[PDB]
């Protein structure tokens, strides 16, 4: 089967947080998440990264209200502060070999 | 910036073609495609591979309605007989090193 997103139904300066897991992670350098702002193709923004807060974000991305939650249980993806212009989804993926499997996602709506 | 999705209103039965080009490929082997669902996590059902037709299907993917155009210009998903099922967003996507990147996608709507 196809897993399902979850969906939250959020409001405007709500501090919201979508949930990937390590459980059954491979090679931690090859995660990371992708965001798909309605009718647009998906972007990595922030991946794993080897370090005391355990990510980089991509490059070009800025935006204060993000963070990860990332340790060996852990690779959470939060925001402060919400709004209408994060509505959208978004995907947590591992790079393996020739392809990517996206482990979750998170739909965000208002 | 993000690139825009192809949107296509479709009407059942109609034969559909997604673009994805080969022209600024690195590695073949690297390049699939994503459907998504509406409400699912994507997911990987066909990739490119070294042969005549020049793709293969994910393991449990079976509909005789999908083949690709695959050459030297093009790595195109066709549908033959499209219907509301097929509804949602498709990406084409080739993976380097840690990440995937995504250089098309279209959604089909009805």
Redesign the interface.
Known sequence: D????H?KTVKRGENVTMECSMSKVKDK????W?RQ?F??????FV?YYSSNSGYKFAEGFKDSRFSMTVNDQKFDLNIIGTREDDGGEY?C?E?E?????????T?LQF
Do not use: H
């Open positions: 196809i897993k399902e997103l969906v350098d090859k995660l990371a992708y702002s009718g647009k193709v998906p972007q990595y991946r995907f993926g790079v070999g020739n392809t990517i499997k996206f482990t979750s996602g739909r």
